Amino acid sequence: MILIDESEPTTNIQIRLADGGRLVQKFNHSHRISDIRLFIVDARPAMAATSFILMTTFPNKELADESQTLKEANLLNAVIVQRLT
């Protein structure tokens, strides 16, 4: 469902889901943050409807511009936290 070009630089992302300490982990690369969102919906269909945002911690930063690339948003090898809204 997520397509990874094996010849491009790649990275892992760890998602902390609100819904319990659900820890999902996934290879991405020059994907957008919006790709993390679709991966999340893909892995937890129930969230398709639910309203949530993605952020990093320490400090809290809301990933507001989902069109940015993991590289641009400095999210290589990062933990992304799902916050309900």
Binding site: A18, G21, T57, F58, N60, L76, V79
Partner: protein, 436 residues
């Protein structure tokens, strides 16, 4: 062997965060923002958030004292790190304040400390952790008594945070965070670094000086004007290295009867040597051993002689370092600056504008500052000022804040020893203080 790192000073002031080099995290396969499990001495563990630091050595980990305490380790010790992938959002945690940090605090602990501290921060905690929360011009310590997913979890927005009354006693090995550390010293980067070098081997690896016959420094003379933080440095170096600290106050010694002075000097060195590794700090050395001519007494000259003798009577001496503070080199007797004595000097100068800023942050850590408060500006208008001046400034600012609110409080009755958490010190308070 790759997961073992050397403990180093924090740059990130958040007690939850430890820092690794970019390369090291690569090597260990750790996510930026990951929860990590630290293993220390005496079978202690801590859980923390890991972040990268560009200036951190590849073999070092940066952590605040809070975490060093929890792991029962000190700067230069060795811990092990490992990811914590299983860590769950906690259902409920139970925390209690340490008694000695909450005397006089008649507030709502949850509402005033815990709620803001944990709110949306995603802090990991482990049972038996002591953490620190600042606020209301005080810093309270709490112990984690229970976590629902035991023994560690993340305090998520849905985690129920319980106190449930009755401050607890401080155990023996649990050092107060109110103790002086390098964290409480601003604007001495260079000199603090020298002193740390001098003292490292003698205080942290004393067994060495039984194995070899090289002489470490014995006496260190800290020089500079009053209020520059010489006492602070000595106290901090002791605490951080886990050495015993013995204060000798010049005036206190000189206040004694002829003979009870010399007896007090002796008891100081004896007690040091008994509890080594140890630091003896001689505050206001010029009160005891002034310029050879400035003494007029005969018992006065006996006291100085007694001090020289005691210095000479220190070989490795179970590993005792003597530190002493004075205004200027030439204020004291040139014989203490002899060889087997105060043969090392360090100048604690007036702080620069950067240093002034560090000092101002140190002395405001527990205050609520309004958004209009600059600090870098206060730094810039205080050129002559030394640490003690800046601390007084913050203190005067805060007391002015309190007076302004005191008429208002007396009228709609007198919450008094409480609303000090809602109170904020404003730039107007600092200006008031800056012109006094």
């Amino acid at each position: 062997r790759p997961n073992r790192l050397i403990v180093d000073e924090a740059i990130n002031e958040d007690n939850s965060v430890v820092s690794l080099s970019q390369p090291k995290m690569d090597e260990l396969q750790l996510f930026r923002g990951d929860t990590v499990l630290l293993k220390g001495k005496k079978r202690r563990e801590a859980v923390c958030i890991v972040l990268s630091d560009d200036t951190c050595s590849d073999e070092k980990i940066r952590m605040n004292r809070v975490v060093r305490n929890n792991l029962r380790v000190r700067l230069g010790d060795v811990i092990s790190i490992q990811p914590c992938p299983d860590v769950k959002y906690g259902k409920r945690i139970h925390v209690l304040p340490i008694d000695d940090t909450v005397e006089g605090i008649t507030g709502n602990l949850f509402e005033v400390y815990l709620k803001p501290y944990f709110l949306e921060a995603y802090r990991p905690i482990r049972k038996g952790d002591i953490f620190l929360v600042r606020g209301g011009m005080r810093a309270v310590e709490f112990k984690v008594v229970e976590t629902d997913p035991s023994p560690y979890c993340i305090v998520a927005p849905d985690t129920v945070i319980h106190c449930e009354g009755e401050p607890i006693k401080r155990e023996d090995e649990e050092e107060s965070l109110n103790e002086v550390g390098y964290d409480d010293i601003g604007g001495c980067r260079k000199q603090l670094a020298q002193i740390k070098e001098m003292v490292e081997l003698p205080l942290r690896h004393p067994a060495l000086f039984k194995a070899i016959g090289v002489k470490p420094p014995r006496g260190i003379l800290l020089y500079g004007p009053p209020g520059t933080g010489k006492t602070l440095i000595a106290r901090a170096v002791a605490n951080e290295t886990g050495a015993f600290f013995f204060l000798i106050n010049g005036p206190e010694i000189m206040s004694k009867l002829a003979g009870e002075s010399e007896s007090n000097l002796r008891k100081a060195f004896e007690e040091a040597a008994a509890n080594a590794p140890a630091i003896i700090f001689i505050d206001e050395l010029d009160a005891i051993a002034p310029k050879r001519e400035k003494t007029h007494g005969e018992v006065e000259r006996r006291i100085v002689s007694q001090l020289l003798t005691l210095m000479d009577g220190l070989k490795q001496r179970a590993h005792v370092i003597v530190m002493a503070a004075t205004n200027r080199p030439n204020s004291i007797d040139p014989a203490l600056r002899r060889f087997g004595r105060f043969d090392r000097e360090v100048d604690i100068g007036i702080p620069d504008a950067t240093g002034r800023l560090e000092i101002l942050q140190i002395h405001t850590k527990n205050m609520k500052l309004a958004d209009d408060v600059d600090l870098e500006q206060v730094a810039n208008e205080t050129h002559g000022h030394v640490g003690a001046d800046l601390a007084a400034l913050c203190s005067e600012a805060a007391l002015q804040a309190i007076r302004k609110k005191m008429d208002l409080i007396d009228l709609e009755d007198t919450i008094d020893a409480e609303v000090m958490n809602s109170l904020a010190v404003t730039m107007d308070d600092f200006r008031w203080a800056l012109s006094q």
